[PDB]
Design a protein around this ligand. Structure first.
Ligand SMILES: O=C(O)c1ccccc1O
Ligand SMILES: O=C(O)c1ccccc1O
Ligand SMILES: O=C(O)c1ccccc1O
Length: 96
């Protein structure tokens, strides 16, 4: 599975890909990596748009990654992902 991704030492699938994501929900964002157990960076509120540069699959979700003003990397989950089937849930916002 995930032939177009590489894999890191934590088993996270990742790939460089750039677009914009506009949230349709309040979505909690994370520091350090694509795990809901990680520290919370904050939240995207509906209608807020970020420009991402990396896509990851980990911890039951597809995530997109961007850089905050300070240079901290911020991990935003955008839909569910089942590792054993590669099935994806509906997107939590709009990609354009
Ligand atoms: O689904 C994709 O994104 C894809 C990309 C490259 C080659 C085969 C693929 O299915
Ligand atoms: O931001 C949320 O409430 C959330 C909900 C489901 C899964 C991951 C999440 O960050
Ligand atoms: O499945 C993907 O390749 C993908 C990439 C970016 C955002 C959401 C996604 O499902």
């Amino acid at each position: 599975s995930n032939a177009t991704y590489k894999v890191d030492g934590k088993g996270t699938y990742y790939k460089a890909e750039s677009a914009s994501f506009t949230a349709n929900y309040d979505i909690k964002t994370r520091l350090n990596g694509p795990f809901r157990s990680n520290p919370q960076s904050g939240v995207l509120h509906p209608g807020q748009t970020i420009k991402y540069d990396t896509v990851m699959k980990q911890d039951g979700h597809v995530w997109v990654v961007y850089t905050g003003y300070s240079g901290k990397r911020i991990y935003l989950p955008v839909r569910t992902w089942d590792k054993n089937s590669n099935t994806l849930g509906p997107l939590w916002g709009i990609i354009n």
